[PDB]
Design a protein around this ligand. Sequence first.
Ligand SMILES: Nc1ncnc2c1ncn2[C@@H]1O[C@H](COP(=O)(O)OP(=O)(O)OP(=O)(O)O)[C@@H](O)[C@H]1O
Ligand SMILES: Nc1ncnc2c1ncn2[C@@H]1O[C@H](COP(=O)(O)OP(=O)(O)O)[C@@H](O)[C@H]1O
Ligand code: VO4
Ligand SMILES: [Mg+2]
Ligand SMILES: [Mg+2]
Lengths: 213, 212, 509
Amino acid sequence: QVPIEIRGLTKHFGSVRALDGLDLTVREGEVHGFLGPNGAGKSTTLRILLGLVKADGGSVRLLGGDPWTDAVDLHRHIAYVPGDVTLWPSLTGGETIDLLARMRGGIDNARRAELIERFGLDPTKKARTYSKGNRQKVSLISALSSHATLLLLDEPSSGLDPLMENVFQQCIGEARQRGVTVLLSSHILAETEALCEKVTIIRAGKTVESGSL
Amino acid sequence: VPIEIRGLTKHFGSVRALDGLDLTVREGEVHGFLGPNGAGKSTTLRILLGLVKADGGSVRLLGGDPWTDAVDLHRHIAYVPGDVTLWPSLTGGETIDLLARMRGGIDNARRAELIERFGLDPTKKARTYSKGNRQKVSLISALSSHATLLLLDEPSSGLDPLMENVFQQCIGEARQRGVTVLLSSHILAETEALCEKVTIIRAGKTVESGSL
Amino acid sequence: HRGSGFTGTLGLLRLYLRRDRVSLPLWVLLLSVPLATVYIASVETVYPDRSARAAAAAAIMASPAQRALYGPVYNDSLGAVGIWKAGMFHTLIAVAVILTVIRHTRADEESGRAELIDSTVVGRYANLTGALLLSFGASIATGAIGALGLLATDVAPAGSVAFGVALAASGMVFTAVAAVAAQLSPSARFTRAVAFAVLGTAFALRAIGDAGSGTLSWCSPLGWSLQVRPYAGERWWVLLLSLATAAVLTVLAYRLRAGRDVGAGLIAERPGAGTAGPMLSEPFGLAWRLNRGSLLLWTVGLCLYGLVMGSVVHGGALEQAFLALAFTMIGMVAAAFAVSLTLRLHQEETGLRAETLLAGAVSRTHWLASHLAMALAGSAVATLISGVAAGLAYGMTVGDVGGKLPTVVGTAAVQLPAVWLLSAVTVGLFGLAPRFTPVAWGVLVGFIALYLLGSLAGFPQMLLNLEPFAHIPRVGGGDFTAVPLLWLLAIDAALITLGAMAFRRRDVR
Ligand SMILES: Nc1ncnc2c1ncn2[C@@H]1O[C@H](COP(=O)(O)OP(=O)(O)OP(=O)(O)O)[C@@H](O)[C@H]1O
Ligand SMILES: Nc1ncnc2c1ncn2[C@@H]1O[C@H](COP(=O)(O)OP(=O)(O)O)[C@@H](O)[C@H]1O
Ligand code: VO4
Ligand SMILES: [Mg+2]
Ligand SMILES: [Mg+2]
């Protein structure tokens, strides 16, 4: 009943202190904001959660298991939207969606067509011809249309015009209805107010303030 | 008039990339450039730099055709790409002053102030940047040159609400001293407080362009 | 004012030249120094008599199989006999210049640096001219050093200059081919494949022509280097044939660059499919989809080459000797194939596409053994198909195909451990020092050098054991112990397991 619970995390990248005692707690059904300045530790934490980086201390309990040792049984319920989206230049836009969603929980054909219709993507075009805004709709549609009880979105609306970033807000608001925990790491302080409550702010690896809005 | 696009068109394959555009920028004014996610904005920016070859219409940049005078007009133009990629091996300072040497000009008094104001750390290998400090490299290398026409593609992407404010302040100072800017934003909070006489393109052709 | 399409060439040249300051001196020296110090040097000890070289020169012109690989011998003079085995450098220099040109033009332009560069005051043809200047300079330097070295020996002075100029011209002919081929597709791999298909065709035509009448050896950029005929009466004018071609090719390359839209090539892309078929739902399926074209091309090329080396072989103590030497080259080429397939792991990771995959139901072994399995399977299939083709051709040209086919298939198959050892080395490097993964190529080249220059230079039989190609047994009659095969397979397994265990405890950054 607690998807994320981090206590005293720490991580050194050599001579750089990326994290110095971060505290975070999500409560199974809330859209948790994750704010912070540039160079604070907002991805590094997401990469520690997914098991791509080894923590130097503290305790992490993602969905009830270690993110590093149980990094397979837990990833059948997690959808990840990278900060900088990179795709395969030879695969079509409509094949990347199915390929990515077929390694996570599994795609939902009822929602895939609906999301392609309401985002206005073109699913028959090589992925090296996408204009940085349709390159993000691929990740967004592949993540929103899946069986996942936790979304680790990382700056999800980078490169979206003022109407698609309202369609995305509506989609998140509708996805949260059917009990889907969300962790939203963003810089635009206009979508966090509309979506998120109980925000947490980090400055230099340490949480400075937390709580509801 | 630095920009005089008067009917530009471009087809890549069968994809109607650009179907008749009517941009017009004048001297010493900031000029927004808005539209949805397929309009043809980055393609117009590339065409103005002589990097995509227009397949029709008339383009006129600073008084000469962009394609044939592409080497001569680049002494007055600074470009900030939408997708910023840097040399992995080089450092921040090495990248900045290499791009300055290649363009044949910098302003060190402004460069040092920009580095201290954006908070960039000039001594880190470029591969160890958090993409927000990787946009700052392009911003510092463009705002500190002697160019008199900035083609900013999507500058404030990956910048927290403080460096975004610093960027707005720097653009204001730049416009005070004669620089002309053509800015594509997708953020309607900087367009309102920065520029006037915006231009909106829907499918390749302008739909509404005029004073804010 | 004062603007030409070439403005900014010197700066681009000076930052291309500092990109590779450890590779260029090494491979310029490696193809020039061991001409007067190894090849010519070791002819006064193997053939230490005026009448002894006559027998060797007679045993070459009377065996098509041997002179298919190296070329003919036109007299018994010391220079002609000594430099005979050095007629392989015309292909290595071509490989080097092709790789350099593509690496500097298309490899970085595809990665997104063309927009960063061209938005500055650089000219349009600054990049192409920088790369061509670099490659032409390298192919001049190697030839000049080789000629200067050969001029210090007791051989005739005209022949040394002739060979130096021939090496330089063969280096220049294929730089233009690489420049033209880099303007074709927006993918570096396809451009390399097109550039190397031409070199493979040239080598095949050279071999077919020189194993017979010889009139077909005039239709290939290689061959115009052997008909200069150093130390046998020089045909100077044929150099024009190698110089009037590059100028025709280069002036085409620039033309293709005239209107090209930096980032593209010649043919616009085509729409694909909207849905993934029930095969692309796994790391294995995705890995196979990325590697269809490479496997098909490599298999077809190796089959076509084997179909020629198995036909010129017979116009038993020499047949076995030649068929055990014509397959070492196939082993080296297949090792290059294995390394190029295995480096796709490093290409994926450095492109931030490993995180997107490992943030799912994929462990850091079901992903590794999706490119490793392809590297171990494609090379084996290519080598076995080439062996079958060569054996079938040899049996057909003898008269019975049911007897020699098993022997030739075994001879081709016993190369596999020394082909998989290079994949093992690359995977072991990816897991300890990921940044230093592309040095595997260097290792491979080292082995090749130690195979060619090792025995001739008189190295002790303990520094010559440090390569796997020297340990492979002989199939046919005796001389088969199968002990080195077990040791090589054990070494492959140890390297692979160390590389896999060192990847499971690491940060994917
Ligand atoms: N290299 C290319 N080849 C073919 N089609 C392309 C290429 N680049 C872009 N396109 C297509 O042509 C049009 C041009 O897109 P463009 O780059 O102008 O979009 P954009 O307005 O920059 O998007 P965004 O505003 O989100 O950055 C789009 O339909 C795009 O998919
Ligand atoms: N590979 C790395 N090498 C060095 N420092 C790194 C590396 N990865 C991350 N860091 C450091 O981690 C800190 C936080 O990075 P990140 O989480 O991306 O920042 P942000 O909070 O802006 O998202 C920064 O100080 C950054 O330099
Ligand atoms: O450096 V960032 O806060 O754009 O991940
Ligand atoms: Mg980040
Ligand atoms: Mg754009």
